[PDB]
Structures are given as C-alpha cells and as structure tokens.
Amino acid sequence: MSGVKVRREDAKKVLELLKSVGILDGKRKAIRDEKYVIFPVTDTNIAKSLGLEVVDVELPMRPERQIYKNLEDLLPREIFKKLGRLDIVGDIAIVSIPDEILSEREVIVSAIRKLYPKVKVIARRGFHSGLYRIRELEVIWGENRLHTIHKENGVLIKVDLSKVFFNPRMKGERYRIAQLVNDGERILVPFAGVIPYPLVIARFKNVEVYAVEINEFAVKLAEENLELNRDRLKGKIKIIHGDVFEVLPNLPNFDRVVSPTPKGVDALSLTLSKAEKFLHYYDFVHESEIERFRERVLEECRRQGKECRVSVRKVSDYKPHVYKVCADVEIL
RNA sequence: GCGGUAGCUCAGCCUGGGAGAGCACCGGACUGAAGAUCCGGGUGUCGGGGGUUCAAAUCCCCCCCGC
Ligand SMILES: Nc1ncnc2c1ncn2[C@@H]1O[C@H](CSCC[C@H](N)C(=O)O)[C@@H](O)[C@H]1O
C-alpha cells in the first residue's frame, strides 16, 4: 500500500515503465490532481531503484468486479486442491465437489457466484450412467431445476440435464466437424441428443442433416431447439425419434456420417455402411490400443468393399490412459 | 432502444491508467469405475475510423454488422 508521484506530462511514460517492470498495483486505483498523478505500486524498493519519487498515501480500492480473480484466488488452498473443474451451461453451474469437503461447499457456492453472478443454479457433479448417458446431478444451491438454454457457436440449445446428455466442451469438436462439412452434402447424425451437432453443422453451412435419437425427452428438446434456431441456421435439420440400430437400415445413404457413439456401443459397421464419402466415428480407446483401433476400422472398411484412408485422433481424456477418439474415414 | 472484448460463452465500461474468467485449443503426466483428474502455455485490431486527454476497451462523434 504505497504510491508514485509523477508530473502529469510524464504520467503515461511512468505508467508503462511500471507496467514494463511489473510493480503497478492493479488492486488499487490511481489518484490525480492538476499538478501530479500518483500510481499505486507493489514494491517501493524497485520504485526508488528506478529513481522515482515514492509516496505513502491512501489510494482507493477498486470495485471487485474490476479485479481479475480466478476460482483458485477466492478459495482456501486445501479445498481448491480438492476441487473440481467448473463448467457453466446456461443458468446452471456444474462442478465436481468432492465428498470430503462439502461443508465448504457453501463457501464454494459463494466463490462461484462471486465469479459468475448471472448463474442461478449450482449443482454437484457425478458420472454418466444408464443408456441415455444422463449424468448424475444434484443441486447444492439455487433454483431447484436442471433445465436451461445454453449458447454455443452461435446456436441456442435447450437442455434439461436431468433427462438428457449434453457436454459443453464438445463445442470444440463440433465446430471442427462443422468446418470439415461442405455445403450441399446430406449428413446423418445418429445418437443426436438435443441435436447440438446438427444445430452447429447447419449453423455454419447449408446442408441437410438427419438426426436419430432414442430418448423421447431429448427429441422433445431437439424440437424446441430447432424452433429456437429456425431463423439462425443456414441448413435444414430433420429429427427422427427411434433406435439407431432399427432406424438406420431403412434410411438412404449420406455424404457424411458423424457418429458420437455412446460408451460401450459398437455402431462402426452400421454407420460406415450408411456413408459413401466421410465417416467420423467416435469411440473410447486406451492409448496403447489406438493403433489397433485403426486396424479394426480398416478391417471393417475392407469388409464392406470400401477403399478408405483412416486417421484416428484423440478428442478428449475419458479416464486415465483412455481417450475419446475419432476415426476420420475418407471413402474413395 | 440495445448488443459487438480470446476459438465458444461472458465479466470489466457508470466514475479513464494491470487484456481478464470458465471452457475450448496446444504440449506433457496419470492402470480396474471415471464423457474424468493433474502440470505447463494466452492464442487479443476490445468491430472500424475520428475527437477530448499526459493516457481511451472505458467518455463523445461518425461508419459497419445483427435483435
Ligand atoms: N439405440 C439408440 N438409438 C438412438 N439414440 C441412442 C441409442 N442409444 C443411446 N442413444 C442416445 O445417444 C446419445 C449419446 S450422447 C449424445 C451425443 C450428442 N450428439 C451430443 O453431442 O450431445 C444419448 O442421448 C442417448 O440417449
């Protein structure tokens, strides 16, 4: 808590000098008069070593909204070590609050609302289980609801996280798939959920996309999502309520197939059977098996009489040494 | 009348002086369950131009783009 006195004509030069060495105090705020300007500094010793006049005065603390804080900043060391990455989906804030530390859950709550004020629901995070891949979520703060509208890559996505699968992070993958698509192709997305992949693909390109999903409430909020985005999309989307393994054999074929396969499911043969130009097949593979995974894909390609180039890439960390991966199959 | 800030979603603007958050993305680590977790990295024309000022993301004017 101390300051720098500089002539107003030199105020800017001193300012960026202090930035250059790095002793300007961002927590406080600078006072000025017609004669001089005072800048708060972190260390006076290097201020005088640079040869500046150093003064001790009370400078106003800045509003907290203007102080750069992270989630580690506002939490004791121990329970931050225990946490617990934060993910925000619309109005819901989802975090993994470990079981040892739930008393500081309430302290945790404050931090999140100090970090994100516009969020109305804070929920504790479990795992994905069952066959709709719904994740275990319980609300530790706020409005007792698990549904909200979420913005991603320019689209609106209605999600009730207690009845459907949705992961915000896959936004990255979605944009990238959206970029591989070319205008005019017909695309099939099995296991489409609340159609985030359709909505993003059609958001950035003029295509027709078929979406197949089995969860009836997921098709409900896919409907509502398409209504929500009707004036936003360049392409067209059609939603099919059904089982992929029953629905797909009766559909026509598609330029590109994007299969976010559910954990444990083998849809490689079917989805590849419905593709002529591109298949993007997601799977869960341990690192040391990744190359074998590729051979499996190549095997299936030649079982269908297709000539393909196959490249598999890591998409995300699923569990220790296991990655969510995608096989890009280019059919010739 | 509002809104345009990192790749996405957004704080910061009232009342001028640190380019920030979460996630994405890149690199690395981690044996049973895990759509995880750990460590490192900011990748920016604050839509653009002008004005006031020692100094503009912030205040004023004009232009562009979407409700
Ligand atoms: N046999 C089947 N037919 C159609 N959909 C299925 C299915 N088995 C599971 N699903 C659905 O496929 C989804 C897998 S997770 C959803 C992924 C979605 N594309 C997204 O990125 O959000 C789940 O919603 C699940 O309900």
Separation between the CA of A9 and the C1’ of B59 (whole angstroms): 20
Interacting residues of A196 by C-beta distance below 8 A, sequence separation 6+: A152, A155, A157, A166, A170, A174
Q: Is strand B in 7 Å reach of the CB of A169?
A: yes
Backbone angles phi and psi of A178, in degrees to 5: -60, -35
How big is chain A by its Cα radius of gyration, in Å? 27
CA distance A225 to A228: 5
Ligand 1, residue A165: give the atom nearest the CA: 24
Q: Is the CB of A89 under 6 A from ligand 1?
A: no
Contact A256, A222 (CB under 8 A): no
CA distance A76 to A294: 45
Cα angle value A94/A264/A161 (rounded, 5°): 25
Separation between the CA of A36 and the C1’ of B50 (whole angstroms): 29
Is A244 labelled as part of a ligand binding site? yes
| HSE-up of residue A287 (Cα within 13 Å, Cβ side) | 6
Contact A238, A208 (CB under 8 A): yes
Distance of CA A74 to the CA centre of its chain: 22
| HSE-up of residue A269 (Cα within 13 Å, Cβ side) | 7
Backbone angles phi and psi of A29, in degrees to 5: -140, 155
CA of A261 to the centre of ligand 1 (A): 7
Q: Is strand B in 7 Å reach of the CB of A318?
A: yes
CA distance A229 to A222: 10
What is the CB neighbour count within 10 angstroms for residue A130?
Answer: 9
Q: Catalogue the E-assigned strands of chain A.
A: 2-7, 31-32, 36-41, 53-55, 86-89, 92-95, 121-128, 135-142, 147-152, 155-160, 186-190, 208-213, 236-241, 254-259, 275-286, 308-319, 322-331
Q: Is the CB of A212 under 6 A from ligand 1?
A: yes
What is the CB neighbour count within 10 angstroms for residue A126?
Answer: 12
Q: Is the CB of A166 under 6 A from ligand 1?
A: yes
Q: Is strand B in 7 Å reach of the CB of A210?
A: no
CA of A58 to the centre of ligand 1 (A): 60
Please tell me whether residue A89 adopts helix, strand or coil conformation.
Answer: strand
Q: Is the CB of A267 under 6 A from ligand 1?
A: no
Is A100 labelled as part of a ligand binding site? no
* Method of elucidation: X-ray
Domains of chain A listed by start with CATH number = 2-66 (3.30.70.2580), 72-150 (3.30.300.110), 151-331 (3.40.50.150)
Positions on chain B within 7 A of a protein C-beta: 7-14, 17-25, 28-38, 54-55, 57, 67
CA distance A207 to A225: 17
CA distance A225 to A155: 9
Interacting residues of A71 by C-beta distance below 8 A, sequence separation 6+: A80, A83, A86, A111, A112, A115
Amino acid identity for residue A210 in this structure: Y
Residue nearest atom 26 of ligand 1, based on CA coordinates: A132
Q: Is strand B in 7 Å reach of the CB of A302?
A: no
